[PDB]
Design a protein. Structure first.
Ligand code: MG
Ligand code: MG
Ligand code: MG
Ligand code: MG
Ligand code: MG
Ligand code: MG
Ligand code: MG
Ligand code: MG
Ligand code: MG
Ligand code: MG
Ligand code: MG
Ligand code: MG
Ligand code: MG
Ligand code: MG
Ligand code: MG
Ligand code: MG
Ligand code: MG
Ligand code: MG
Ligand code: MG
Ligand code: MG
Ligand code: MG
Ligand code: MG
Ligand code: MG
Ligand code: MG
Ligand code: MG
Ligand code: MG
Ligand code: MG
Ligand code: MG
Ligand code: MG
Ligand code: MG
Ligand code: MG
Ligand code: MG
Ligand code: MG
Ligand code: MG
Ligand code: MG
Ligand code: MG
Ligand code: MG
Ligand code: MG
Ligand code: MG
Ligand code: MG
Ligand code: MG
Ligand code: MG
Ligand code: MG
Ligand code: MG
Ligand code: MG
Ligand code: MG
Ligand code: MG
Ligand code: MG
Ligand code: MG
Ligand code: MG
Ligand code: MG
Ligand code: MG
Ligand code: MG
Ligand code: MG
Ligand code: MG
Ligand code: MG
Ligand code: MG
Ligand code: MG
Ligand code: MG
Ligand code: MG
Ligand code: MG
Ligand code: MG
Ligand code: MG
Ligand code: MG
Ligand code: MG
Ligand code: MG
Ligand code: MG
Ligand code: MG
Ligand code: MG
Ligand code: MG
Ligand code: MG
Ligand code: MG
Ligand code: MG
Ligand code: MG
Ligand code: MG
Ligand code: MG
Ligand code: MG
Ligand code: MG
Ligand code: MG
Ligand code: MG
Ligand code: MG
Ligand code: MG
Ligand code: MG
Ligand code: MG
Ligand code: MG
Ligand code: MG
Ligand code: MG
Ligand code: MG
Ligand code: MG
Ligand code: MG
Ligand code: MG
Ligand code: MG
Ligand code: MG
Ligand code: MG
Ligand code: MG
Ligand code: MG
Ligand code: MG
Ligand code: MG
Ligand code: MG
Ligand code: MG
Ligand code: MG
Ligand code: MG
Ligand code: MG
Ligand code: MG
Ligand code: MG
Ligand code: MG
Ligand code: MG
Ligand code: MG
Ligand code: MG
Ligand code: MG
Ligand code: MG
Ligand code: MG
Ligand code: MG
Ligand code: MG
Ligand code: MG
Ligand code: MG
Lengths: 76, 59, 188, 136, 98
RNA sequence: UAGCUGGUUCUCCCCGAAAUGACUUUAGGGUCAGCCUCAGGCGCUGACUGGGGCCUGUAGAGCACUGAUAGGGCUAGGGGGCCCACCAGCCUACCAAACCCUGUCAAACUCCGAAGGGUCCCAGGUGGAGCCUGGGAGUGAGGGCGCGAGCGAUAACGUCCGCGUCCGAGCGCGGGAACAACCGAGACCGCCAGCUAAGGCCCCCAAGUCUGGGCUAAGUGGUAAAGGAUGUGGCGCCGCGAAGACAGCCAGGCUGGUCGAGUGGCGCCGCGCCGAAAAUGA
RNA sequence: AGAGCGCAAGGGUAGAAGGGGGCCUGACUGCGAGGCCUGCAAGCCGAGCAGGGGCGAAAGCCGGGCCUAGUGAACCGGUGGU
RNA sequence: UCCCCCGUGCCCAUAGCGGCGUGGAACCACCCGUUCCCAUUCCGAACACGGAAGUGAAACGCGCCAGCGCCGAUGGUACUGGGCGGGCGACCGCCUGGGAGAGUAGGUCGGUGCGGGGG
C-alpha cells in the first residue's frame, strides 16, 4: 500500500494545574491554538504557549463567550 | 472511629497490584491473619477495595 | 378508564419489575410523585387506553386524578414497557396527540393503490374537557400521487392544530411487484 | 452510496440503539440477534416479500447497509484488504426493525414476513403494532 | 468597536474612560479588576461653560487637581472608540500638562 | 577471526529481574534509559487509601457541524404526451438539488457526555516502602488467560498494540481423569494433631445411597446451527358452548335429531425430541 | 462565523491572527531567571537586563510570518574579518 | 435611603431574535453648517471641528408578550470503577458504588457592582 506514516507525538495540553505552586516562567500549558487564554500574570509565545510571569498559584476561569483563561495569583 | 477487626480469607494471588498494596497498607501478611484498626475514612477506603478478600468486623 | 395505582418510595426499581409492578411517576405543573401500577392491569388498560383517552388513577388516598401518559420508556431488546409518565390535568388547556379515523374509499385503492397514512394521530392545543374520541378524516377524493395536509384538516370546536399548518397526513403510493423487479434488476 | 474507502470492523455491543418501534406500516420484523446484514440479504428479502404478494401494498426497509465489507484475494498479509467483495452491511442489533409492510391483509403480511425471515441470517420475530408510541 | 479598550485593560491600572457627548465631555479614572471610579471630572454636566475644546482642557486640569490629591499618576488613558485629535485630545492634553 | 554452537567442577544463608523504549549496514549483536543487588547518605517522603480543586473527549447517546440515508410533502432543473415557433402555456402512478417532516448511520462527524484516569494540596500509611551518590549485574526471542481496539474471515495454540494477571523463575502442593499459565493456594525443617480452600461426599476414591420442594424419559445429562414437531409440565389471552358446543353416527344442502361436558386457535416460561455421516476398539 | 488566514490536515481565530492605508526594517547585537520535552545528543517556550533603534500622543508593542513540516552531528575544505 | 438617566466592570442566551407600547424637562442620539484642526482608494455615510432652530422618525433607555432561540427538573434507563455467576460459543445475567444523552413537567424577555448628572 502507501500509508504507514505519522509525525511523532507533540505531548501538548495542560502542563500545570489549578492549586499548583509555580516559579517564574514555568510553562503552564502548551496548546494547539487558543484552547486557553492568558490572564493575570500569564504571558504567551509564538506557539500559544502559556507561562507564568510571576510566582504563585495557577487558577482556571471559564467565561463562556470570552473563553477559558488561566492566571497565577501572586503571594509570598 | 470504633475498632475494625479485619481477617484475610481470600488469597490475593491473582488480584491487581493495587489490591496487594491495599493489604500492605492495612498491614495484612498471611492468610487468616487478625488485625484490628481504627475506622478512619482512609482506612475504610482500603478495606473496602479488598472487601471481597476480607471479612470486616465492627468492634 | 380506571387504574389501581400506588405510592412508591424506596422499593428497588428493578427488583420491583420482577414482582409484577410497572414503575411510573405522576406529575404536573405543581405535582411530582413516585408511583407504580400493575403490569397485567396497565397492559389491558393501556392497550385500548393508549395515549389519546384519559385515565383516572385511584391512589389509596382515595384521590381520583385525571392523568394521561405523557411518555413511556419502551425497553429495547424485545419490546416491553419499562417506565411510565403520568401528566395530571386540571382546567387549563393542554396539548396532546388526538386520534384520527381516516374514513372513505380513496380513488387510489380503486386503480389499485396503497393506503398511505402519515400522522395516525395529531398533537393539538385543547381544553381538558374536550376529549374527542377521534377526528373525522374526509379521505376519499384522494387519488394516486395525491396527499392530504394539516392545513386541510376538519377541526372540531374549541380546538387548534398545535403543529405546522402544512404538515402531511396521508397519501397514496403505488404497488411494487413485477414491473419494478424486472426493470430494477437490469437498470441497476 | 458515497463517502470513502474502507472502515474499521468494530464490535457489536449491547442491542441498544439497535432496536426501535413500528414507525410505519402495520406489521414489522425485528431482529433477535446481532449481525451484519448484507446488501444481498436485504434484496433477497425485499424481492421474496413483493414476489409473494403480487401487486402488493408498500414495503418499508428501515435498515440500510453503509459499512464496506473488507476481504482478501486468497493470499497473505500485504496491507489492508481490498474489501468490498460482499459489498456492504448494516449493523443490526437485537430489537431492530428491518422490514415492515402496509396496505395489506394480516395473512399476506404474516406469511410474507415469515418468508423474508429465512432469507436473513438472524433468528427473528414478527410484531403487530399495539399503540406504543410517545404522546399523552 | 473597542479593541483599544481591551488592550489597555491588560496593561495595568487606572484607566481613563473618556466618553464624550456631542456637546459634553465626561472623564473617569476607573481602576479595573474591581470596577471603581476615582476622579470623575464631568464637563457640561458639572459646571463648565460652553466651548467643547477649551472646556476639555479645563476638565482635564480638573482631574489633575483631584488626582494628585489622591496620590495617583498612572496616565492609563482610554481612547474610548475615539480618534485622538480634538476634544479627547485636549482631555489628556491638559490632564498631562499638569 | 568466529556478533555462531557446545562446555564451565564444593556447601549454606539473604535479595531477586527482563524478554520494554530510543538510536544502531540494527534486527538471534550492541550503547543509554527501565526493571535486580550491595555500600554510604536522607528520614515519613512510598505503593494503596480519605477529602478537596484542576485537566480530559472514550462508553453511551446525539444530528447542532462534515458526510451518509429509506419514505413523504413542498419545490428548481431535465426526460416524455397536447399545441404552434405570436414561446410560451397545461399536464406528468418518470430521475431528482435546496428546504420541512417521519426514521436512521459514521474510527478519521459531535450540540452533549459518564463511570474512570491524570496531577497538586492536607491527611492516614515504618514498608525487603521511599528519595540522593556510588560499586556489581543480568535483560533487551517472550507465552497463556481476562478485558479494550487494529489486521484477519467478529478463522487460527493467528497476528499487532493497551490495562491487568499467572507461567516465565512456583513442571513444588490441592482440584480439574491426565495437562506451564483455569479454580484454590505463595512450599524454612519435623509430627501416625486440629479448622478450612477450590472441588466434592454411590463403588474404584476420603467424606450424605443426607433432608425438603419442583422438572426431565432423552443416557438428555455425557457438552453442535438455521429450521421442524398434538414431547412433557407450568402461566396468560381470544372464538363457540347446558338457549346443547368440538367428534362420530341418520337426513338435507350451515340446519335439525341423538348423546352429553367442555372444546378449538394464539402467545410466553422450564426441561426435553429431530436436524446429527469418517476412517486401529469402544 | 458555515469565509479568510500563502500550501496538507488539524487546533485556533472577526472583542482578528482576517481586508486596507500611514510611517518603518526588532527577518537587531550582547545575554538569559525559569520551564516543556527527553536515554544521549537534539528540539521547544521565555519574562526580564544593558546597548543602540522603529512605530504610536501614550500606556505600550517589535529579538520575522495564526500555530504544528520546509531538513543534516562530527570530520575535511572554501570566502571575509579580530 | 427611593426613582429616571449617562459612563463603565462582573455573571455569561433564564441577558437574545421578532412583535406592541412608551421617554425628550434633564441626558443621549438624530440634527444645522463644512470657514478652522481632521477625514474618506468616491461622498462630512464614517472619523473631525464650530454650533441656532427642529425631532424622538431611526438608534439607544424602559416596559409587556413566548411564536423562534436559550435554559430545563423528576422518574427510569443506556454505560460503567470493583465483585461474581451461567452457557460449548457470537454473548447474556445478578450483587455493590457512580450514572448520563435524548424525551416529559417546567422556566425565560434578565440579575448586578462602582462613580456621576437630575426631582
Ligand atoms: Mg503505525
Ligand atoms: Mg501524533
Ligand atoms: Mg515575545
Ligand atoms: Mg506568531
Ligand atoms: Mg487465583
Ligand atoms: Mg491510582
Ligand atoms: Mg375512539
Ligand atoms: Mg396526479
Ligand atoms: Mg400530487
Ligand atoms: Mg393538497
Ligand atoms: Mg470521496
Ligand atoms: Mg483511498
Ligand atoms: Mg469496513
Ligand atoms: Mg423494537
Ligand atoms: Mg506466504
Ligand atoms: Mg433464519
Ligand atoms: Mg468587579
Ligand atoms: Mg523471597
Ligand atoms: Mg529520532
Ligand atoms: Mg536488539
Ligand atoms: Mg527478521
Ligand atoms: Mg548477531
Ligand atoms: Mg542497563
Ligand atoms: Mg508526594
Ligand atoms: Mg503521594
Ligand atoms: Mg485523593
Ligand atoms: Mg481550588
Ligand atoms: Mg474507557
Ligand atoms: Mg466516538
Ligand atoms: Mg458509539
Ligand atoms: Mg441539519
Ligand atoms: Mg419514490
Ligand atoms: Mg418521491
Ligand atoms: Mg419547497
Ligand atoms: Mg420537457
Ligand atoms: Mg410518449
Ligand atoms: Mg418567430
Ligand atoms: Mg414548450
Ligand atoms: Mg402519467
Ligand atoms: Mg417518484
Ligand atoms: Mg425524527
Ligand atoms: Mg445536556
Ligand atoms: Mg467530569
Ligand atoms: Mg472517579
Ligand atoms: Mg471525572
Ligand atoms: Mg486520583
Ligand atoms: Mg519499622
Ligand atoms: Mg525487594
Ligand atoms: Mg523493590
Ligand atoms: Mg542506583
Ligand atoms: Mg546501581
Ligand atoms: Mg509482546
Ligand atoms: Mg501478557
Ligand atoms: Mg465472519
Ligand atoms: Mg475482529
Ligand atoms: Mg466465522
Ligand atoms: Mg513482536
Ligand atoms: Mg515476580
Ligand atoms: Mg510470581
Ligand atoms: Mg501436575
Ligand atoms: Mg496443577
Ligand atoms: Mg511452569
Ligand atoms: Mg502451576
Ligand atoms: Mg471460585
Ligand atoms: Mg514473587
Ligand atoms: Mg470450620
Ligand atoms: Mg452427593
Ligand atoms: Mg434419597
Ligand atoms: Mg444439540
Ligand atoms: Mg435449538
Ligand atoms: Mg416436516
Ligand atoms: Mg421441513
Ligand atoms: Mg415426567
Ligand atoms: Mg414447551
Ligand atoms: Mg349438534
Ligand atoms: Mg440418526
Ligand atoms: Mg474556519
Ligand atoms: Mg500581526
Ligand atoms: Mg475582507
Ligand atoms: Mg495586505
Ligand atoms: Mg502595513
Ligand atoms: Mg535553562
Ligand atoms: Mg535533555
Ligand atoms: Mg521551528
Ligand atoms: Mg544616542
Ligand atoms: Mg514577534
Ligand atoms: Mg509558517
Ligand atoms: Mg500579519
Ligand atoms: Mg503544536
Ligand atoms: Mg571520518
Ligand atoms: Mg423620579
Ligand atoms: Mg410621544
Ligand atoms: Mg436640511
Ligand atoms: Mg470640502
Ligand atoms: Mg475649505
Ligand atoms: Mg471605501
Ligand atoms: Mg455631518
Ligand atoms: Mg414611531
Ligand atoms: Mg424603541
Ligand atoms: Mg417558548
Ligand atoms: Mg435546547
Ligand atoms: Mg450554560
Ligand atoms: Mg432534560
Ligand atoms: Mg436522572
Ligand atoms: Mg480508586
Ligand atoms: Mg470491571
Ligand atoms: Mg447508585
Ligand atoms: Mg449530567
Ligand atoms: Mg437530562
Ligand atoms: Mg434538544
Ligand atoms: Mg427575571
Ligand atoms: Mg432577575
Ligand atoms: Mg449595568
Ligand atoms: Mg445598586
Ligand atoms: Mg421630588
Ligand atoms: Mg419636579
Amino acid at each position: 500500500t502507501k500509508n504507514g506514516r505519522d509525525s511523532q507525538a507533540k505531548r501538548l495540553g495542560v502542563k500545570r494545574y489549578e492549586g499548583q505552586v509555580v516559579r517564574a516562567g514555568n510553562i503552564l500549558v502548551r496548546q494547539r491554538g487558543t484552547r486557553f487564554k492568558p490572564g493575570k500574570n500569564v504571558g504567551m509565545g509564538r506557539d500559544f504557549t502559556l507561562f507564568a510571569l510571576v510566582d504563585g498559584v495557577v487558577e482556571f476561569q471559564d467565561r463562556g463567550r470570552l473563553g477559558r483563561y488561566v492566571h497565577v495569583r501572586p503571594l509570598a | 472511629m470504633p475498632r475494625l477487626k479485619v481477617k484475610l480469607v481470600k488469597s490475593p494471588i491473582g488480584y491487581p497490584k493495587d489490591q496487594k498494596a491495599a493489604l500492605k497498607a492495612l498491614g495484612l501478611r498471611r492468610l487468616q491473619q487478625e488485625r484490628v484498626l481504627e475506622d478512619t475514612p482512609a482506612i475504610r477506603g482500603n478495606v473496602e477495595k479488598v472487601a471481597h478478600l476480607v471479612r470486616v468486623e465492627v468492634v | 378508564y380506571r387504574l389501581k395505582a400506588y405510592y412508591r418510595e424506596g422499593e428497588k426499581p428493578s427488583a420491583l419489575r420482577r414482582a409484577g409492578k410497572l414503575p411510573g411517576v405522576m406529575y404536573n405543573r405543581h405535582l411530582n410523585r413516585k408511583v407504580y401500577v400493575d403490569l397485567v392491569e396497565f397492559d389491558k388498560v393501556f392497550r385500548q387506553a393508549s395515549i389519546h383517552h384519559v385515565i383516572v388513577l385511584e391512589l389509596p388516598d382515595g384521590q381520583s386524578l385525571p392523568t394521561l401518559v405523557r411518555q413511556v420508556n419502551l425497553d429495547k431488546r424485545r419490546r416491553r414497557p419499562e417506565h411510565v409518565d403520568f401528566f395530571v390535568l386540571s382546567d387549563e388547556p393542554v396539548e396532546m396527540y388526538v386520534p384520527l379515523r381516516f374514513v372513505g374509499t380513496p380513488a387510489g385503492v380503486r386503480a389499485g393503490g396503497v393506503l398511505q397514512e402519515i400522522h395516525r394521530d395529531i398533537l393539538v392545543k385543547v381544553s381538558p374537557r374536550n376529549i374527542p374520541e377521534f377526528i373525522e378524516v374526509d379521505v376519499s377524493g384522494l387519488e394516486i400521487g395525491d396527499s392530504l395536509h394539516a392545513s386541510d384538516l376538519k377541526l372540531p370546536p374549541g380546538v387548534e392544530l398545535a403543529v405546522s399548518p402544512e404538515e402531511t397526513i396521508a397519501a397514496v403510493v403505488p404497488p411494487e411487484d413485477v414491473e419494478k423487479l424486472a426493470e430494477e434488476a437490469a437498470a441497476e | 452510496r458515497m463517502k470513502y474507502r474502507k472502515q474499521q470492523r468494530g464490535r457489536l455491543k449491547g442491542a441498544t440503539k439497535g432496536g426501535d418501534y413500528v414507525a410505519f406500516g402495520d406489521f414489522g420484523l425485528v431482529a433477535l440477534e446481532p449481525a451484519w446484514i448484507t446488501a444481498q440479504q436485504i434484496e433477497a428479502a425485499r424481492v421474496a416479500m413483493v414476489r409473494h404478494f403480487r401487486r402488493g401494498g408498500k414495503i418499508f426497509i428501515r435498515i440500510f447497509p453503509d459499512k464496506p465489507y473488507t476481504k482478501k484475494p486468497l493470499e497473505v498479509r500485504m496491507g489492508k484488504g481490498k474489501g468490498n467483495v460482499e459489498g456492504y452491511v448494516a449493523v443490526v442489533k437485537p430489537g431492530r426493525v428491518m422490514f415492515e409492510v402496509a396496505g395489506v391483509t394480516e395473512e399476506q403480511a404474516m406469511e410474507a414476513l415469515r418468508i423474508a425471515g429465512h432469507k436473513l441470517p438472524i433468528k427473528t420475530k414478527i410484531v403487530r403494532r399495539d399503540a406504543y408510541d410517545e404522546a399523552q | 468597536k473597542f479593541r483599544v479598550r481591551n488592550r489597555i485593560k491588560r496593561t495595568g491600572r487606572l484607566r481613563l474612560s473618556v466618553f464624550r457627548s456631542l456637546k459634553h465631555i465626561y472623564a473617569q479614572i476607573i481602576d479595573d479588576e474591581k470596577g471603581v471610579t476615582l476622579v470623575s471630572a464631568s464637563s457640561l454636566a458639572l459646571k463648565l461653560k460652553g466651548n467643547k475644546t477649551e472646556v476639555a482642557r479645563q476638565v482635564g486640569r480638573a482631574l489633575a487637581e483631584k488626582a494628585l490629591a489622591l496620590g495617583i499618576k498612572q496616565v492609563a488613558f482610554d481612547r474610548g472608540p475615539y480618534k485622538y485629535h480634538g476634544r479627547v485630545k485636549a482631555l489628556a492634553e491638559g490632564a498631562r500638562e499638569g
